[PDB]
């Protein structure tokens, strides 16, 4: 493509076996801030970050740090994603997608492959906006 | 005041339990609990009333549901997540040292003690710890 390839490092690359979701609070960051933000969230929580994900196609950089999922980018780059307040990392997104459609939720984006696996996000009937993602190993990982 | 929960003491948590906040209009929490139970395939594990604040709350898997009038919710609505931790005071200290603003508390709650913070990057997060109340 015309944009650089993703870069992805993570401690655990497959969520297939984690039947209990891992819950993330979304954090939105301005350009130039993600390394200091990772350090801030590491030191706040006493926990080392476990994913660094650079996504040049979307002009985004992401990191998992304890309870928080950090997204860095311009306002324009963040705009499609900013209303999402939480991410659930689950074993398989498809049952959640199916149940949400049946329960009247509006699927915003996806389900779609991502460099980490696959994800979708949804506007729930009560107005909550959340992303569901599952992780699968990438080639060479 | 109703207080029911499966776990009443977070003192031994090896890591925080993380909640995404959900906000609800009066009269809707029973249907909301059902929605989040069925989405996740888990039964809700806490339900309690906070009459001083005119709120009702429930924990359902990944979500913390808050039901109240617009007036009751207005001071709390900007919080997007709650961390249930073993003890809130080390987090309070570290947040102050990093320049965060403590916008509510530390205060007692029916469940233990909590505070709300505005982090320097604009994230608004609650930190709460749970302790057994007299009669649990």
TrEMBL record, chain B:
<protein>
    <recommendedName>
        <fullName>VOC family protein</fullName>
    </recommendedName>
</protein>
<dbReference type="InterPro" id="IPR029068">
    <property type="entry name" value="Glyas_Bleomycin-R_OHBP_Dase"/>
</dbReference>
């Amino acid at each position: 493509g015309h944009m650089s390839q993703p870069f992805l490092w993570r401690r655990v690359n497959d969520s297939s076996g984690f039947a209990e979701p891992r819950v993330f609070i979304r954090v939105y960051l301005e350009p130039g801030s993600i390394d200091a933000a990772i350090a801030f969230y590491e030191d706040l929580q006493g926990v080392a970050h476990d994913m660094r994900f650079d996504f040049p196609e979307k002009r985004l950089t992401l990191a998992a740090v304890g309870a928080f999922l950090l997204l860095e980018g311009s306002d324009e780059a963040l705009a499609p994603f900013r209303s999402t307040t939480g991410t659930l990392l689950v074993d398989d997104i498809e049952p959640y997608h199916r149940r949400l459609l049946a329960a009247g939720a509006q699927i915003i984006f996806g389900p779609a492959r991502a460099p980490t696996g696959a994800c979708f996000n949804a506007l729930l009937p009560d107005g909550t906006v959340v992303e569901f993602v599952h992780h699968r190993p990438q080639p060479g990982e």
